């Protein structure tokens, strides 16, 4: 009836401090389709984040990619914050350049 989202946060290219890149939050495996996804820089919502058109897998579960341009540094923390009907509270997943 309801399926909770899988969440992955990662970069388009291998991370290099001071080098412009793309920050991605991929949400997949969820049903129904309504979902709220924010990208965060040091806890604050990044503006003008774009996302892909709603699509789904062979098992009917939905997926979306949210993305924004970013220049990673040593100090700055990034994350993805996701809410869905299956979640009683928003789920925050931190960006780790090794994942």
């Amino acid at each position: 009836i309801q399926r909770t989202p899988k969440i992955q946060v990662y970069s388009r290219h291998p991370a290099e401090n001071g080098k412009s890149n793309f920050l991605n939050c991929y949400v997949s495996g969820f049903h129904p389709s309504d979902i709220e996804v924010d990208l965060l820089k040091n806890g604050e919502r990044i503006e003008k984040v774009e996302h892909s058109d709603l699509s789904f897998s062979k098992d009917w579960s939905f997926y979306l990619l949210y993305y924004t341009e970013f220049t990673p540094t040593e100090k700055d923390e990034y994350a993805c914050r996701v809410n869905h009907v299956t979640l009683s509270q928003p789920k925050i997943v931190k960006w780790d350049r090794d994942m």
Binding site: I1, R3, K6, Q8, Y10, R12, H13, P14, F22, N24, Y26, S28, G29, H31, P32, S33, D34, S52, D53, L54, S55, F56, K58, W60, S61, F62, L65, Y67, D98, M99
Partner: protein, 276 residues
């Protein structure tokens, strides 16, 4: 190689917030090429890949009309599904459809699809014979009865054997630079101590297209399925995909582990190890 074309419909009711939203996306393999959204400012079929942009104005008008008619069809379907399942008008429900065709290297039909789901569960599907239906329940059996009476399967077969493989052939030629180019994975193994006597070995695959890939770890030549963490293949946003597989291994034992990579862009499967 072998190729697929698929259209994916999502129709989602939203009582109190207007008529149900209808979205269509079309793919060749793992490449989005067309989209329609009923909530768009001036809804029409829009190109999403450069090679579809050479289709003339007649193509776009015809395709837009199909989507506008579908918006109404799938809104009716949502109303009908409410009735067949004895559901209230207060709730939000979803119908999905996927349909299209697979072809081989020679471009001939391998198989056709036309499947619908209701609230994420199978509803009705065209069988591989393209001449009969599988209904998931007594509600879908009503639809099956209607579609048998109307000879819907024959009309789907004609599309799947004709226009579906005809347009896919054309798209593959027009998009040959990209659609018929496999990008192999760029691979490497990373090594991170977790603790004194445990390390994580993570095998990475980056920059590959299409999305289909196999990544596995072996220890002493034996598959390590249970103790491998494998993430879902994920889009990079530049057409390509990424994936990794990780295993936690005892310190000093790293050389007993091998990562194996299979992808259509590789002429032979690759074997990788941690390289200190």
């Amino acid at each position: 190689g072998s190729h697929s074309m698929r259209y994916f419909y999502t129709a989602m009711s939203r009582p109190g917030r207007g008529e149900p939203r209808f979205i269509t996306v079309g793919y060749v393999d793992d490449t989005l090429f067309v989209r329609f959204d009923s909530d768009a400012t001036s809804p029409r079929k829009e190109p999403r890949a450069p090679w579809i942009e050479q289709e003339g104005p007649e193509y776009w008008d015809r395709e837009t009309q199909i989507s506008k008619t579908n918006t109404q069809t799938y809104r009716e379907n949502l109303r009908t599904a409410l009735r067949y399942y004895n559901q209230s008008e207060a709730g939000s429900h979803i119908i999905q459809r996927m349909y299209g065709c697979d072809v081989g290297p020679d471009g001939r039909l391998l198989r056709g699809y036309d499947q619908d789901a209701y609230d994420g569960k199978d509803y009705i599907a065209l069988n591989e014979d393209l001449s009969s239906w599988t209904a998931a329940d007594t509600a879908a059996q009503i639809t099956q009865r209607k579609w048998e009476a109307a000879r819907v399967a024959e009309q789907d077969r004609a599309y799947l054997e004709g226009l579906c493989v005809e347009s896919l052939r054309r798209y593959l030629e027009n998009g040959k630079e990209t659609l018929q180019r496999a990008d192999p994975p760029k691979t490497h193994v990373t090594h991170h101590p977790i603790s004194d006597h445990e390390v994580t070995l993570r095998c990475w695959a980056l920059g590959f297209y299409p999305a289909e890939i196999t990544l596995t770890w072996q220890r002493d030549g034996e598959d390590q399925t249970q103790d491998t963490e494998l993430v879902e293949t994920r889009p990079a946003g530049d057409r390509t995909f990424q994936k990794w597989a990780a295993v936690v291994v005892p310190s000093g034992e790293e050389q007993r582990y091998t990562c194996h990579v299979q992808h259509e862009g590789l002429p032979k499967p690759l074997t990788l190890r941690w390289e200190p």
